[PDB]
């Protein structure tokens, strides 16, 4: 977590830089992907 760590989306797969991905969790490119992976799946 310094320069621009990559955060891959478990839902869509899209990968980006922490400062570009959802700061909330960072695991998903969007909050929807969070409520979706949670309300539609489990890990
Ligand atoms: Zn996504």
From Swiss-Prot:
The chain holds residues 82 to 124 of 705 of the full protein. The lineage of its organism: Eukaryota, Metazoa, Chordata, Craniata, Vertebrata. Part of the E2F6.com-1 complex in G0 phase composed of E2F6, MGA, MAX, TFDP1, CBX3, BAT8, EUHMTASE1, RING1, RNF2, MBLR, BAT8 and YAF2. Putative Polycomb group (PcG) protein. PcG proteins maintain the transcriptionally repressive state of genes, probably via a modification of chromatin, rendering it heritably changed in its expressibility. Its association with a chromatin-remodeling complex suggests that it may contribute to prevent expression of genes that trigger the cell into mitosis. Binds to monomethylated and dimethylated 'Lys-20' on histone H4. Binds histone H3 peptides that are monomethylated or dimethylated on 'Lys-4', 'Lys-9' or 'Lys-27'. Zn(2+) binds at residues 9, 12, 29, 33. It comes from the Eukaryota. A zinc finger (FCS-type) spans 1-35. It comes from Homo sapiens. It is found in: Nucleus. This is Lethal(3)malignant brain tumor-like protein 2.
């Amino acid at each position: 977590g310094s320069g621009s760590e990559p955060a891959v989306c478990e839902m869509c797969g899209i990968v980006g830089t922490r400062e570009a991905f959802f700061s909330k969790t960072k695991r998903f490119c969007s909050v929807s992907c969070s409520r979706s992976y949670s309300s539609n799946s489990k890990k």
